[PDB]
Symmetry: D2
Subunit: 189 residues, 4 copies
């Protein structure tokens, strides 16, 4: 459950020094997690997931992508998993299933209060071999729940980008950023 903990002292990275979608010129305060940061973290995370599912003699695993917030995370994550199982010479069959007794790894976007991931975990437990949750981001409240694999622990702010949406928008953004009030007013109701 230990991860890259973004402290509330971190002010982020201003958008002017990166490549963001020109569509969101005035709508972003700063970049929180660059895209390459996400990739680099997902490498080590892929190693952790693989060696965990080898410590337990798992015959196979099935990733469950929760659309549409976890697609980029699932894509890069599957790249890292196939890469790791490729280099290490293991024979670990992985399946991918998208939803809006087998080993199930939930591929989620972010945990805020946990009311959504717990209904899923209780939905698959309604007779499954195993149920695990992997979340790219985690929100620091503290919440009583934590996923099994966590990439980043972020402050109590609303983030967008990397297929994370603020009212069905900002998904085509390359990095993980925090909206300001201008974009909030522009894309909310």
């Amino acid at each position: 459950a230990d991860c890259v903990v973004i402290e509330d002292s971190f002010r982020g990275f201003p958008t002017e020094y990166f490549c963001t979608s020109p569509r969101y010129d005035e709508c972003l305060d700063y970049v929180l997690i660059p895209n390459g940061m996400i990739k680099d973290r997902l490498e080590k995370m892929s190693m952790n997931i693989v060696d965990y599912y080898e410590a337990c003699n798992a015959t196979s695993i099935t990733l469950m992508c929760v659309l549409k917030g976890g697609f980029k995370f699932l894509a890069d994550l599957v790249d890292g998993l196939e890469r790791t199982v490729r280099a290490r010479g293991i024979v670990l069959p992985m399946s991918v299933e998208f939803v809006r007794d087998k080993n199930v790894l939930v591929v989620e976007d972010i945990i805020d209060t946990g009311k959504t991931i717990t209904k899923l975990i209780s939905h698959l437990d309604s007779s499954t071999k195993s149920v695990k949750v992997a979340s790219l981001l985690v929100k620091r409240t503290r919440n009583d729940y934590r996923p099994d694999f966590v990439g980043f622990e972020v402050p109590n702010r609303f983030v967008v980008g990397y297929a994370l949406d603020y009212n069905d928008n900002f998904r085509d953004l390359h990095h993980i950023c925090v909206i300001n009030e201008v974009g909030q007013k522009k894309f909310s109701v």
Copy 2:
């Protein structure tokens, strides 16, 4: 449209000189298209798509992922489109819908052999009063006689041989392969 033609005389590249997942040891005949070649073609496909919708004045574009096969394809293609939209400074909003009104729908599918699936899907799209309906296909099977229909954007035109990898499946197996490969008969029998 015109694309990279994988000639029938192409013998492929043997899997031993690339990285294959260990679970398909004696199941792959050869490697037809390496992953990196797919990506390098997807760069040009992204440019073609973006400046097509820029020749038009599309207010947005809605990509339709045809699951489960087109998921890697849609991933790297969305990376290409995003990378050329922000590289040319053009404002062009892109949304992503998934399957298994009055918008510019770009269908993203894995391969087209006969065209039954793409015909049914396109017919379903024609009822919702879409602004435009274009189709982007990664692979196109060269059949005899040549198939009556061809997509608006095509990555590779490959021979009439069953291919797997890059999320191309064979009874929900072979998806976790990095490259597009032709199966042998031992692998076709191994999964039934």
Copy 3:
């Protein structure tokens, strides 16, 4: 102007990123992950191409200063090639590791500035047509024409940056501790 890494930033723990097992105990933290470098180099390359399009430069010659900037030159040349290629412009590029009267973009690793002064001074012998300098990192006052990150006055390794021809194979840009700083003393 670039990305400023303030001094109150402790970095990220090495145990959360993939690092070479060679330097298990010799790394305090990571300042800048590798992918963040890759994402900043996009904007930096765009800035360089835009400066060489404000005027009509008919050529550009990148000067790699081995051994520190070979990774930075690799990904920088990749970004420049990808930008020139993406914008359909005809910007011919050469790499220089006797070829004079050319626009020079010096690709150095990090800058006191006493080394870059030796570079620019040595350039006056051939009299280049134009000289500009781009550096990946700057430690805390002089500034090159293109800067990527601004780091504290601490010591950084990785990404071909070396402490006595060492730590170059490290993927990310890290900060070492005193035990590692003494385990590779010259």
Copy 4:
């Protein structure tokens, strides 16, 4: 069974379906090896090199790049090497040096040198180097060549690690040059006639 063989029947891919430097628009016949295919090959090459130098417990391993021609191949090769060593917990200390010869210590002795060159054709350019390296009392001298030209008759020398075996046509791109041009090209291509006349000696 040394490497990927690009048979003489292979006609390549037309340059219009890939992203090419627009200045060489009319100078390229076709694309021989796309960039991503090169990197895909360099994954497996990195694995082979790593487990070779680990099977014999090589203390140090020093990659020597033949400069200008072999730079990009060195960069992607080092990428793959550090990646595959990172994913295995292996400790394999690698160094990097460069040559054009322009590199001398003379402490190269007792070390394991891995030569990183761009392409082998006749074999004399590399033979002079291996002769100049086996004179410094090195523990081992091996060569990694990205491309190898198919010669008639077959060349009496084949490097230890080969990426691709290409037909006997002239190739450019991916730091491969023709009269110090075509280096900024992204893929490995073959020059046509207009490109052969546009950069003559």
